[model samples]
Target: MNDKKIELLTTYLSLYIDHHTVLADMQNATGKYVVLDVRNAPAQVKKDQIKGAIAMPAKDLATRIGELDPAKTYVVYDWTGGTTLGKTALLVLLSAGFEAYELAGALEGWKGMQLPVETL
Candidate 1:
């Protein structure tokens, strides 16, 4: 790949945090970060989500953004890969100067990693 391509890829890559890294950090964190479930499905939100995640549909983020604190980092995840909600939410978070990242692999990926989830 060209240098430009490599640079862009690297920049985008940094926006993602793997499941293992997030899980470990969450375990030690008191309230340093917030995990967001940006999935559009209400059923899934009520059924199960990452143990500590809060549901905020990506489309409604612009309105609900006020609910979040700027001092904390935010990790966003969607139902599966290839969905736009995670990236859409990340843009809002990043543009607002909040430290944010997209959780790599999303919900299904997290489940595949054998991580814990809680029902709302």
Candidate 2:
């Protein structure tokens, strides 16, 4: 990603929160942000998802972009550190003029912080 894009994205992503931050924030005001899980497969999302992450397949992001609130900040994530899914979803949202961004370092980074994750 270009520096400009990264810089812009960083603004939308929560301030590189650790597990403690996520937990504390979720407990206090979970409604403040929306969590989008852009995994390619729904089963994958069902198998493992952040506590309240919404399940939206990456391929369908464009068509369903409108389902999201443009004014709300979104935190997108996938299975690993790769931002392909998150980035793609963000671009689609941006194209639709929605305010969105990828979670820094993706879900793996969340796991690295020992944050709680839910699995089906």
Candidate 3:
């Protein structure tokens, strides 16, 4: 019964990204991609966020799709890269015809790389 869900996930497996890879892209391409923070956890929302990332919880995506440009590439991240929230956002973007990707290390990986994070 859940085979469809599993299949969809498997199809997008290659779309996951390494933090360093995205870091390089961000530096070089600049505005070519938008980093989205899709975590809705209360405490996390109050904490620092990935530098330059826009906060839009996964649950709000379907309603907020118009706020984003479909032409730009989107990189979704959650509290951890391994969580379902980021992946859910990715799926939402793709289904809505927006170019999107998942962050493999997420905020954890970004911090591990000593990347800059800012308070909202």
Candidate 4:
């Protein structure tokens, strides 16, 4: 193992552990907390969005980090609640010191709706 490998391990070790096995169920995870829909216009819709879920499209995640609270925990969901993009959002939030979790299988029938699809 080289220095670069060790560095990578430390940086990503937490990320890997963060998403290990535990997953939040979107249905039961409604209310009292911040739920972020990190999908896009295609697979994001108001009707299917979990109650109290805020729009945080995956495309603008990095720039939209300011909208979230570093101390607050958030539940992120994408097409099926499990996606590469969803994982990306998780990494950003976790790396920034925010407690975040993925909403596994958020939407079953709709792999995809979107209201404004941006900012909202």
Candidate 5:
């Protein structure tokens, strides 16, 4: 697990998506790249997910990857600097031939950056 964590951290740093920039880039459409919230607490996610994020739990992402277009980009995030759930979602997307990146700071990082977070 430690080795996996290290690899995930390295990969995250190598391909991090800024929360603010990603939100700005989203054109408010389903086809566009959407934020993937793979946290355990889907309820919390509903309370404080990014405005355009899609709630795709980590447990179900692999089976649901088909719902996302392979041609579009995916920015995945979780509560803690994108460690477990976030990393899992990213790997799944990559394995599925979709372009994916992790949100550098995750939700906490975004909050620390003072980026806007929406509650649905």
Candidate 6:
């Protein structure tokens, strides 16, 4: 095999978190995976949010990377999943060797689907 093939087979298989699958992923045999809001405090306050999310902005990750345990899994999301910030965050977590997944379409999509959110 080659480096390219190795990259192709990398564990990002769970990278895209779709609505249908994500709802189911909330719980599992092993346990619930951690949810992340990569958007900052102001943005999150402006909009509803995923309850129980470990709210951390992309900028803050550099200082707080140590807070995340390498043994866990995380699903990171942003306003629309199209923000460079959101993409950057997922990459940062992955680079740190954490198992990270990007929430496809992000919170906007969740709101569009009328999903529930938390107050704080």
Best-matching candidate per TM-score = 1
Clashing pairs in 3: none
Task: Write out the backbone clash pairs for model 6.
Answer: none
Q: Give one digit per residue, the lDDT tens place, for model 1 in 3-112.
A: 99999999989888877778887788766768998887776435888988988888888889999999988999988857777888898999998999999999999888
Which is the leading candidate under lDDT?
A: 1
Q: How far does residue 49 in candidate 5 sit from its true spot (Å)?
A: 0.6
- Stretches of model 2 off by over 4 angstroms after superposition: 1-24, 44-46
**Model 1: clashing residue pairs?**
none
- Between prediction 1 and prediction 6, the one with superior TM-score is 1
- The superposed Cα distance between candidate 3 and the true structure at residue 13, in angstroms, equals 3.1
Compared with the true structure, what per-residue lDDT tens digits does model 6 show for residues 67-87? 988888888888888767777
Sort all candidates by lDDT, best to worst.
Answer: 1, 3, 5, 6, 2, 4
Residues forming the 10-long window of minimal summed lDDT in candidate 3: 41-50
lDDT of 2 at 10: 71
Model 6 misplaced stretches (Cα beyond 4 Å): 1-14, 27-30
Mark the 10 consecutive residues where model 2 has the least summed lDDT: 13-22
Question: Candidate 3, residue 86: CA error in Å?
Answer: 1.5
- 29-88 in candidate 4: lDDT tens per residue? 533347687878844344455545687787888898998877667777777644587788
Native-referenced Cα lDDT, model 1: 0.86
Higher lDDT: candidate 2 or 5?
Answer: 5
- Can you write out model 2's per-residue Cα lDDT over 1-120, one digit (the tens) per residue? 699898987775543334454467677885666788888875743587887888888899788877888777677777774545667777787678766656766778777777767885
Expressed as tens digits, the lDDT of each residue in 31-119 for candidate 3 is 77789888886645458787788888889998998999988989988877665787788888999998888988888888877897888
Q: Which whole-number lDDT from 0 to 100 does residue 4 have in model 5?
A: 100
lDDT of 4: 0.62
Worst 10-residue lDDT window, candidate 4: 109-118
